[PDB]
Coordinates of C-alpha atoms (C1' of nucleotides) in Angstrom, one line a residue:
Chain A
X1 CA 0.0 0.0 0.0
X2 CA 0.9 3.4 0.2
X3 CA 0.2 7.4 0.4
X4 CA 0.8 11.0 0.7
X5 CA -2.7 13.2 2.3
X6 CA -4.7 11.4 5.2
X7 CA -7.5 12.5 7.2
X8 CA -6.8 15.3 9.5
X9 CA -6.2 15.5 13.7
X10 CA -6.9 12.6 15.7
X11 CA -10.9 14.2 16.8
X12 CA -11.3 13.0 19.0
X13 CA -11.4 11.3 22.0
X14 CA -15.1 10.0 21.0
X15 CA -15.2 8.3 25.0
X16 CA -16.1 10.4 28.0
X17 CA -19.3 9.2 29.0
X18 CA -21.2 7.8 31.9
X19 CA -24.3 10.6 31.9
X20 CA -26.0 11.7 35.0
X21 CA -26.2 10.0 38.2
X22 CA -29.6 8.9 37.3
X23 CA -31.0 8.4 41.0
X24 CA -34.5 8.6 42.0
X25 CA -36.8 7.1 44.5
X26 CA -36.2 3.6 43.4
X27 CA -32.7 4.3 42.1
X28 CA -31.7 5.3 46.1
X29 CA -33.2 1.9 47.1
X30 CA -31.0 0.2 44.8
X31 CA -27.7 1.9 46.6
X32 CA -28.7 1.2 49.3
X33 CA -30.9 -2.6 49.8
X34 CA -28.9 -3.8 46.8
X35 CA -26.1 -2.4 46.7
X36 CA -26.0 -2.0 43.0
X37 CA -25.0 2.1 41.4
X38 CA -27.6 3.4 39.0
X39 CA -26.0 5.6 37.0
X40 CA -27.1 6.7 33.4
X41 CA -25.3 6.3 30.3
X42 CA -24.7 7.9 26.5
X43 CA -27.2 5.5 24.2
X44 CA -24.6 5.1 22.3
X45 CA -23.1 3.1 25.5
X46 CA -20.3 0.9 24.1
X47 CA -21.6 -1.6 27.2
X48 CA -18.3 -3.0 28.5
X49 CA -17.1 0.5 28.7
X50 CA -19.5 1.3 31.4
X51 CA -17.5 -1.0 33.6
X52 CA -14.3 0.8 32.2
X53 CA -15.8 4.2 33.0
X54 CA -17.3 3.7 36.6
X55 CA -14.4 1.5 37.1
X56 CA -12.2 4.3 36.3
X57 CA -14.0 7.6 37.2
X58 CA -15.9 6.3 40.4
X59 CA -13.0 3.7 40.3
X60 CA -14.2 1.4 42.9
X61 CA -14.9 -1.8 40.8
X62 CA -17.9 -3.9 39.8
X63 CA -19.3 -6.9 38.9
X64 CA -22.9 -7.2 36.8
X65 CA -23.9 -4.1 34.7
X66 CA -27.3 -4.8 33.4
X67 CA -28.4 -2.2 31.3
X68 CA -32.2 -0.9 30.5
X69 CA -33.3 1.2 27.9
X70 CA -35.8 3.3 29.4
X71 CA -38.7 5.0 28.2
X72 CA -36.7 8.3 27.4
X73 CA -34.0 8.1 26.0
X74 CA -32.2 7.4 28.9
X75 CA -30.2 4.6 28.4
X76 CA -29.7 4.1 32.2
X77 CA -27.1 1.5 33.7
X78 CA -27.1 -1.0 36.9
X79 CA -24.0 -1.2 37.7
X80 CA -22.9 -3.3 41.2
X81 CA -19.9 -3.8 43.5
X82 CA -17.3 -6.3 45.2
X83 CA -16.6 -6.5 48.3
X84 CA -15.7 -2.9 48.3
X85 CA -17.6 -0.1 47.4
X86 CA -20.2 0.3 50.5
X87 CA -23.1 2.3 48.0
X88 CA -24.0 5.1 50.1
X89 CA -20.3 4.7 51.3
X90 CA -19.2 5.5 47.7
X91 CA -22.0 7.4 47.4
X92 CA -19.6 10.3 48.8
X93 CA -20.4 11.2 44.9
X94 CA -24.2 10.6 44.7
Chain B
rA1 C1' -108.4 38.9 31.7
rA2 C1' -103.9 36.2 30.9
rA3 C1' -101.0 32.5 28.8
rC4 C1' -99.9 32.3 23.8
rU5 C1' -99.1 35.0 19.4
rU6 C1' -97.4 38.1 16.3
rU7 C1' -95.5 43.9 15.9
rC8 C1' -92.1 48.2 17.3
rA9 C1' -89.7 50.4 20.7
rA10 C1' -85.1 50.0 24.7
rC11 C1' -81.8 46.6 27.5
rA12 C1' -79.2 42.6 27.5
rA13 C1' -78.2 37.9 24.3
rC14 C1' -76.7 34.8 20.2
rG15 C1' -73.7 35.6 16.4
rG16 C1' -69.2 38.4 13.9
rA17 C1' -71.0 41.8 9.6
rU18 C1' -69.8 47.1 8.5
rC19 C1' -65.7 51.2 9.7
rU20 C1' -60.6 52.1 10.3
rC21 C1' -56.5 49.3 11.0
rU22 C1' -51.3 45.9 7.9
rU23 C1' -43.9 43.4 10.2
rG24 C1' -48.7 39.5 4.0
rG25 C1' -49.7 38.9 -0.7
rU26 C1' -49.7 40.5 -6.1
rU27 C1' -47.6 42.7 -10.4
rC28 C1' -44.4 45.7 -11.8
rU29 C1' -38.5 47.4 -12.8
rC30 C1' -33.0 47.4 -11.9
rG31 C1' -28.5 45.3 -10.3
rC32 C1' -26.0 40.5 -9.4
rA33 C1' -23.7 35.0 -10.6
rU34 C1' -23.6 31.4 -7.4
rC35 C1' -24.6 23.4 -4.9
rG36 C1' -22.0 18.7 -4.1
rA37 C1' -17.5 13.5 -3.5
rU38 C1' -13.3 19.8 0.1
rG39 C1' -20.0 14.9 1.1
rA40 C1' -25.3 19.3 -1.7
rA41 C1' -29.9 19.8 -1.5
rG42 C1' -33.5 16.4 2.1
rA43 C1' -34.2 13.3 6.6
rA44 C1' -34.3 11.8 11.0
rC45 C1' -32.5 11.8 16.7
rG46 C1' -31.1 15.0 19.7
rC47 C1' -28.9 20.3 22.1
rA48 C1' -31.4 25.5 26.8
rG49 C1' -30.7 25.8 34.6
rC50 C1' -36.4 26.6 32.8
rG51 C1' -38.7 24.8 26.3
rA52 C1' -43.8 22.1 23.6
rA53 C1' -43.5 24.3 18.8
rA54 C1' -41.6 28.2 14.8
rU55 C1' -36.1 29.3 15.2
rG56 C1' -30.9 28.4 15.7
rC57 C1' -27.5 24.5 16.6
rG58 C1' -24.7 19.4 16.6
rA59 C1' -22.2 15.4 22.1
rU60 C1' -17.5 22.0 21.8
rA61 C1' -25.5 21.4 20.3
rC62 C1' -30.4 28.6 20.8
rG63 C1' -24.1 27.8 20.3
rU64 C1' -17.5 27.6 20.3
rA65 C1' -13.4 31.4 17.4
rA66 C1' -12.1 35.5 15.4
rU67 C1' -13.0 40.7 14.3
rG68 C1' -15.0 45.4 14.7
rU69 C1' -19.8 47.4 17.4
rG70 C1' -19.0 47.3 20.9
rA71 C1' -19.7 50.4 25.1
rA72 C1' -23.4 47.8 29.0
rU73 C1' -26.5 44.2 29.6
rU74 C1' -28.5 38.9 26.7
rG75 C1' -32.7 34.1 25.6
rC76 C1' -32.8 42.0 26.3
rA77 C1' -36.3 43.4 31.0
rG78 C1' -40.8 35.9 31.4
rA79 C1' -39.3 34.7 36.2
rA80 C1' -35.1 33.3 38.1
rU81 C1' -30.8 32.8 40.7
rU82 C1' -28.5 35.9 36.2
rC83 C1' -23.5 37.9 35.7
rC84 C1' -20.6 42.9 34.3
rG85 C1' -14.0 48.8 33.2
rU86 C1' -9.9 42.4 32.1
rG87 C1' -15.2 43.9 27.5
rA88 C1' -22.2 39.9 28.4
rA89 C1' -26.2 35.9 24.7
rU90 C1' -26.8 41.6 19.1
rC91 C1' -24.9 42.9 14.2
rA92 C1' -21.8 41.8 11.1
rU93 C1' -18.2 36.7 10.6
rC94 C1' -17.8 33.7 6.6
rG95 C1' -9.2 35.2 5.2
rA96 C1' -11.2 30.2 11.8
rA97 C1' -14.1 25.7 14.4
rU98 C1' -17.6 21.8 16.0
rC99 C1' -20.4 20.0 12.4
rU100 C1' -24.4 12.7 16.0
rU101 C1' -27.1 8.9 12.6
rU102 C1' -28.0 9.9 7.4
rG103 C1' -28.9 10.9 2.4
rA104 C1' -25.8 11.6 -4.6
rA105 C1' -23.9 7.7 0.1
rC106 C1' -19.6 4.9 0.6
rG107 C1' -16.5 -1.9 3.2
rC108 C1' -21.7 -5.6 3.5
rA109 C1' -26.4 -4.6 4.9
rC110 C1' -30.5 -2.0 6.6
rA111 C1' -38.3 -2.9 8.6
rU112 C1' -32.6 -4.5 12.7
rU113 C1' -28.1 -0.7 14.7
rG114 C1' -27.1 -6.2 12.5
rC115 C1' -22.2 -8.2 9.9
rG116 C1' -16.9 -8.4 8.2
rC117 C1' -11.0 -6.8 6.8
rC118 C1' -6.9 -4.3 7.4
rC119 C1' -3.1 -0.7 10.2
rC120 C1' -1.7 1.9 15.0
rU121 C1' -1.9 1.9 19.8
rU122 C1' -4.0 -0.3 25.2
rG123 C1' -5.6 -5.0 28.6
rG124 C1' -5.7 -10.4 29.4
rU125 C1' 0.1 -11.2 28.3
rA126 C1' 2.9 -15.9 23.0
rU127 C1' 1.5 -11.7 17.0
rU128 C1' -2.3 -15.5 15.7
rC129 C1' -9.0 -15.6 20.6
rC130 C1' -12.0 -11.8 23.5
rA131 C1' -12.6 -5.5 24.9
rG132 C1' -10.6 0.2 24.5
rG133 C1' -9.3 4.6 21.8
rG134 C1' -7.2 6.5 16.9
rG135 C1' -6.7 5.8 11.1
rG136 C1' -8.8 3.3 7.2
rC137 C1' -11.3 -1.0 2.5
rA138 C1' -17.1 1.7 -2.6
rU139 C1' -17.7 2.5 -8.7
rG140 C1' -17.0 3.9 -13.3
rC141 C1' -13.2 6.3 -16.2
rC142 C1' -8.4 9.7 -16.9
rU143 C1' -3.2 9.7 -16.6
rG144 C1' 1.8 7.8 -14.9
rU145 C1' 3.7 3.6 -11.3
rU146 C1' 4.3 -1.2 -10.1
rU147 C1' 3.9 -6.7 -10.8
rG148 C1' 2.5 -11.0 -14.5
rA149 C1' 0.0 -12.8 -19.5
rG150 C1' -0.6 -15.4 -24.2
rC151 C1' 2.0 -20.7 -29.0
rG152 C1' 0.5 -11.2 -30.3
rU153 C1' 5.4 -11.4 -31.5
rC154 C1' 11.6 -9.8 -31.7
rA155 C1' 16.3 -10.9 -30.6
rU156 C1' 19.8 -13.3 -27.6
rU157 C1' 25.3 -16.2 -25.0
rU158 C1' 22.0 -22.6 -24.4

RNA sequence: AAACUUUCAACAACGGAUCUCUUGGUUCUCGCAUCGAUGAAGAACGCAGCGAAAUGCGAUACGUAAUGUGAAUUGCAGAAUUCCGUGAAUCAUCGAAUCUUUGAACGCACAUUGCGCCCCUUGGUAUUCCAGGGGGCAUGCCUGUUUGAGCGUCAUUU
């Protein structure tokens, strides 16, 4: 093969991207009975990521991250965690 | 005699005509030369602290930059917390950007967000398997480049 243009700069980035803390009446409940963080999410969630991004940003860990599409547009995560993470203890965030 | 019934008065009442209103329309005339593969026209889906739509905009989302205007407020003074003498959302701006998923539509598809192949770089740590970010693989022709094809055919030291 070969060449001599290309494309441009490396735009972007593309990643960020866990949404808003989506937690609500039920969403509490589950950090706190369960255990289990109920963040939200970028449609567009490339799944497996989730882990790497609440892994990362949070950065506690997890282990299950079953993920709804709700009603809105929301594409809203459940997201859980090992031995660690205490829920309301890592929700010193939200 | 009333009720009723017609009739004409005034008052309401149904209705929205007449009058006057005009950021429309309609027809005139006079300049002007520009779309797209450098991804167009069009479509979705989204983007405000608060928004349904018309409007503007694209994950940098009613907007970034840059100018001059500005000189003082914008989405102008809806409210609202709002924030300001180092220049605020307005005009111009197109000597910058961002420009999702698409559409001439483009790797294959597409009643789905489905299915492959390279290259670079991260985790598992043997390149060859699984996940993350970046760059990429349509067609017809133009021209050169670069490999190989026939008993088209030339000549060579055998």
């Amino acid at each position: 093969y070969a060449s001599k243009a290309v494309p441009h700069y490396n735009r972007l980035d593309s990643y960020k991207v866990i949404e808003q803390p989506i937690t609500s009446e039920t969403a509490m409940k589950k950090v706190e009975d369960g255990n289990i963080l109920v963040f939200q999410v970028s449609m567009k969630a490339n799944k497996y990521q989730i882990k790497k991004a609440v892994k990362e940003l949070y950065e506690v860990d997890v282990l299950k991250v079953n993920t709804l599409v709700r009603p809105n547009g929301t594409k809203k995560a459940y997201v859980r965690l090992t031995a660690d993470y205490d829920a309301l203890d890592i929700a010193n965030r939200i």
